[PDB]
């Protein structure tokens, strides 16, 4: 994380004072738990009212144990008794409480993600309701293709983005769990039922099948979901780049306060950051391969990823959303495009006399392609001509946008559950 | 895909004969849902007689340069210019591809929930014959406390029962299937034809789709395809491990020659091929996602890639299940070489001799440490002895004989199970 | 590899009929070797001429012995007597002859690459050279920026599959290596002089430190060439479909039909493929000890297809921009429609020359047919300076930003 | 990047100052080759002696103006009059500074991955030397195969290392580049003379062909190096903790013994092999420019030089203080036999007129190996031939015969004569 998109709520949550936190709410659980047993009734209350964090001093001891869990017992152990600290860190493992604590800081992280999206999922339906009576010309391949409704370009993302929202939501009933098991999870010491309880005072499930450490592919399942995540954003910036440039020229982003150019540099960031999520994801699944019960190679490839995936995913899904609140639509730009281009107009009237007469296609092509008002001589074709009667629509600006338009209704409520 | 993995059912699947069929079955959903507006059973005359002919398609489309195009004109030749009139109307062309690509992996994830499923089957089986068996268990390759033989199993049944749930939970909706037209203005068609020709199909109707349906949806399954990419190495890693010749706790079970001076040379060639294919099956993720970035309302990006690793993907998940069930049950368990090594080393007690004092004792950490050290005789009773003779306190200390261990180590081992199974 | 995208001289070589006769040449390479010291003289070559190749005979014995190299090895000593086939693969292990005859199929790839790369260098310079004395705007961020030489487009693709290319001409020479070096590469019965003898025979060089296998990063530093080649083509496709759409209609590819970039995102998801096998080739960089047969199974994917898609996609990148249809006027008239970028032309020359600040000239250039007689004639009057501003018309314009376009395309073509 | 693994000398190279400071040092070199034009001559060392870099105010400017060149630009053009000032950042754009100066750090994080790589085969080599003399056990799919020289293990790592010292060093010559071109290109206020001359300030070539930005492709083609000498990382680090588990038992890590170092950095190998595939689609830039690589370029390219670095450091170390057990190491080959069937299968048929099929029976019948077979085929056989003995002096004679062919073959310079 670098301090120019570094949001401070974020990294807090994953600097060495809220990991030790964390590991330090993960040892009083299982302690306050083995008070049923043999640790006396009261000592995990005395210990949460003294306790300091000392990030400094656990790195001074680190030198010294060479490993980061005994430098923060420690530091936690000469705060108090030895009477007191007795049972502290008693029967765990040392990725007992680190992976737990772990899945404390990613339960935390998820609620900036998750509260961000929902306000990007608003705010794209906000502006697709705003853009969905004006008319724009759909692009297949790039190409003009038919005309649409500018609002489903908004539409479009707010739905994948809601179906995102779901998948964030189904794993924080479900993916996060915690660890009390042991040493290589085989209940030496410790029981179940001490597992149970801790694991109760935290407030997540148990795991069913705990190694010495949790299994990996839990966290794995969450960076796949950021990486999709990505792609909504992604693909959201690419349909803004697409439409901000001069040759389309039908949308700009706000300048802010204050040489004045409009520029997509908000959007092509946002694309950027989107690349770092979709990295995430490949580090994620191979620290799913870890030898028997556990080797730590997955660690420091979590120090590095884990804090810069909440923390793009957080500054991107609020920098999308300022985004699209400053977002400069110009209709004026947008409609007339469509006006100029008439081109989807033979395929109109091309299936207009299929369903409406019993000619074949190429019956049907010849006679639109032979062809002020384009619909008013053609009809005159069939009754003259062919002596059949009927009337066609009047394929003017008005009659474009109810043709075209005349469905974008039905399309927003089946969006809007 | 080549011959050497390929997978009968699912090759067929993806064939360019079972690519059109699929593809004639939507051409046919969204003609009888517009015979409301198009005669009555001219999509069930159509369906009557159609024929799938891939060697034609090829030669339509050398000239019209377009497989929808030329699969509509091989149609359209078989029937009268006006029972074919009202085919392929008012539809777009990736309204026909994308609700028949989800009918393809609708009928490929059949097979792999199926196959998956039958994978839990073996774990779980392999789970409770070795329950009982006592195993070192390693942290960082090295040697720590006892365990169960059996967890290891268990460990790995649960982890594919997770990614079986999620592929289920994707079963009930992870597809959907539209009828859009050429931006999904819905211009010729309407939300009532698109909507009922869907239950024809019997899938949902996308939401809001564009030429095509979103490909988020075709990367959310990768995803949960590139997760079990992850448990079928971490499963074949563990065997690969017990298989050396050093550690020597199982083989996999083999007229077959092992080597070539060494008839039958026992080695993890299963175990070590699967994860070559969970290496291919883990980079197809990145071009699923790569793939959701299309241009406004569309572009064909995605065509050639998919072409590509969507057959191979399913494939390579369906033949890495079956082999790898294959190899859970004929994998046989060397049950002495296990328990052997777990004899030969004595490290584990001292932690169980220290928490146990502090646990019983008024003592403390490092008082306790120095008692353990100083003391075949019997350590339980040893220092049971100590403690009462020389620190002067009574304490019933369990012995830790070869059965002590697996009482203490496997205590848990119930609720564990409990727990587990489904 | 699917019959849709399938290249003849690509698939032939990956065929189990190409593989199982490269590794007879790899046997046949030893073992006359071998025939120096304790095999007969002449025994490879009477081998050499009666050993036929059935594929349907290796996977007829494969279907027993679960071996590949030993239903090999019994389907070509069948075909012979006891005393014909006696040292037929003899102190070597089966990846000695497994990687020996793989690295000569990817030389054989690695030809045709490097002939379909540099022609795609051909159709690129070609396209160059072609537009190079047309004016177009060049865009930052999509935006409209300044107007540019269109042939400085296709030479900046040119020169990026010139570096590509000679990454490819530096492995060629340095990149594949054989062996022959016994079980785990300990030498028991093979020794480095009839290794070296094999080696030469086979024309490429040995192997430093040889386990088993042969390290597969040498595979993994060619795929890292290929990948960044995906990247090369994606970004030259990308540019083409931006040129294509029909807010830009500056260039379409050449066949009423439909116009669509259709090739140019062909080669898209192509790029995508090749880009994907990079990392694919990296984990199997690490294997177990001496050798764990993981890496065969994904290269038996993998591999056919790369080199597949890369002559492919070459191919029809190089067939696209050949027929690639320019639109001059319209791409000329774009020019002539955009105004605002002189703005910071006259900035530059008035603070170049009148001794005013850059809040000075900036003030007096907005505020002000051609603006070069208006700009000179406030100079003149109000500032006072007799300066000589060159006229900024459609002609000017080009002298003024193609005026180094031949240090750039002769700086960047060798003989040009 | 996160203090744990923070080297300072590289974190600095790519912090605020550094990078403001190659800005400042390109600034002025285009700067000085103007004094051969509109420039007045001797600007350059003018604003060079009194220039201060000042992260903070740049922040503070760009807080207002959202450019992070305009703000670099304000604070060195606020330090001086408006005539001195005048001049400065004149006809180049932007990424005119941005790149080239990323250049300029980018060499810069380069000339101390090369030390540490080249030291890093050193000691590989080194450890080879040890354990050269030492006989092991080859394994195959995790299996005993046949034996083989300890050293070769950390001299298999060592020749591939230096294919990466080879790459990197090549890189090294024709790799960076910088660009004057200015807006797209197309030199409308400079001059490729311009261009030339301020390179030779530099140091660095001319890009061939640049549009507003430097091609990405250079930049993707370090990154790519660095994946692969990341695999190589990676092997090396699974290889000792293979030889360390419990089982084996062979080598542990220098100061309870577990593998945490050669873990550590099996963890930092896949950190960089993610950065690759950014590295990749940083190229796929629309047009002239997009900015979409500058927020990803901040991230994964320090991250990447201070992972190599300490990963090549950390790795030598863990070399030079990995302790080898010779006894658990030559036992082990002694304890099992299965090699020397296939050994005595292969001379049976190399010296006599026997087949395979019927010498590996009489191999399967069978105190001395070598003498019992040698008069079996003399009784019933009636064959006379030298069979060697084959003790443990006699195996290692065997199969290390051709190791200091390996060796030299390895090392460009062993094996040449001076004096
Ligand atoms: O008729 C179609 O569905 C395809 C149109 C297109 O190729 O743009
Ligand atoms: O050549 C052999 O001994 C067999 C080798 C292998 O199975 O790889
Ligand atoms: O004047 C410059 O160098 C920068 C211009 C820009 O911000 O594009
Ligand atoms: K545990
Ligand atoms: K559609
Ligand atoms: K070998
Ligand atoms: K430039």
Redo the contacts between chains.
């Keep these: 994380?670098?301090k120019?998109?570094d949001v401070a709520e974020i990294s807090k949550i994953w600097a060495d004072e809220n990991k030790y936190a964390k590991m330090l709410e993960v040892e009083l659980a299982i302690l306050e738990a083995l008070e049923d047993?043999?640790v006396p009734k009261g000592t995990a209350a005395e210990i949460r009212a003294r306790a300091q964090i000392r990030p400094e001093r656990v790195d001074e001891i680190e030198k010294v144990t060479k490993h980061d869990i005994i430098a923060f017992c420690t530091s936690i152990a000469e705060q108090f008794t030895?009477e007191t600290g007795?049972?502290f860190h008693?029967?765990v493992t040392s990725s007992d409480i680190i992976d737990s604590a772990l899945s404390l800081q990613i339960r935390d992280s998820m609620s900036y993600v998750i509260k961000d999206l929902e306000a990007l999922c608003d705010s794209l339906l906000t502006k697709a309701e705003e853009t969905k009576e004006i008319i724009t010309?759909?692009?297949?391949?790039?190409?003009?293709?038919?005309?649409?409704?500018f609002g489903?370009?908004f539409?479009?993302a707010?739905?994948?983005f809601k179906?995102?929202l779901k998948?964030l939501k189904?794993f924080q009933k479900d993916g996060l769990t915690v660890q009390f098991?042991?040493?290589?999870?085989?209940?030496?010491?410790l029981?179940?039922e001490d597992e149970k309880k801790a694991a109760d005072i935290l407030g997540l499930p148990?795991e069913?099948?705990s190694?010495?450490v949790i299994?990996?592919?839990?966290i794995?399942?969450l960076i796949?979901?950021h990486?999709?995540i990505?792609?909504?954003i992604?693909?959201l910036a690419?349909?803004i780049?697409?439409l901000?440039?001069?040759?389309?020229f039908e949308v700009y982003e706000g300048f802010?306060?204050?040489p004045h150019?409009?520029?997509?540099?908000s959007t092509?960031?946002l694309?950027?950051?989107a690349?770092?999520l979709?990295?995430?994801?490949?580090?994620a699944?191979?620290?799913?391969?870890?030898?028997?019960?556990?080797?730590?190679?997955?660690?420091?490839?979590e120090?590095?990823?884990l804090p810069?995936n909440f923390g793009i995913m957080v500054y991107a899904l609020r920098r999308m959303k300022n985004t699209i609140d400053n977002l400069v639509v110009q209709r004026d730009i947008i409609e007339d495009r469509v006006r100029s281009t008439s081109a989807?107009l033979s395929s109109?009237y091309l299936?207009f006399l299929?369903?409406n007469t019993?000619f074949?296609?190429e019956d049907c092509y010849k006679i639109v392609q032979q062809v002020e008002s384009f619909s008013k001589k053609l009809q005159k074709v069939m009754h003259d001509e062919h002596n059949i009667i009927l009337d066609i629509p009047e394929m003017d600006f008005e009659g474009i946008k109810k043709?075209?338009?005349?469905?974008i209704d039905?399309?927003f409520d089946?969006?809007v559950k």
């Design positions: 994380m670098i120019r998109y047993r043999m030895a007795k049972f008693f029967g010309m759909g692009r297949s391949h790039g190409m003009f293709a038919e005309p649409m409704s489903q370009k539409l479009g707010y739905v994948e179906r995102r998948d189904d098991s042991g040493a290589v999870g085989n209940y030496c010491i029981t179940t148990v069913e099948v190694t010495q299994p990996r592919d839990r794995a399942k796949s979901i990486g999709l990505a792609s909504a992604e693909r690419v349909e780049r697409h901000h440039r001069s040759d389309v802010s306060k204050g150019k409009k520029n997509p540099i092509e960031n694309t950027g950051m690349r770092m979709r990295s995430h994801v490949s580090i699944l191979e620290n799913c391969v870890l030898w028997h019960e556990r080797d730590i190679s997955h660690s420091s490839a120090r590095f990823y810069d989807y109109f299936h299929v369903a019993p074949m296609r043709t075209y338009l005349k469905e039905h399309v089946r969006s």
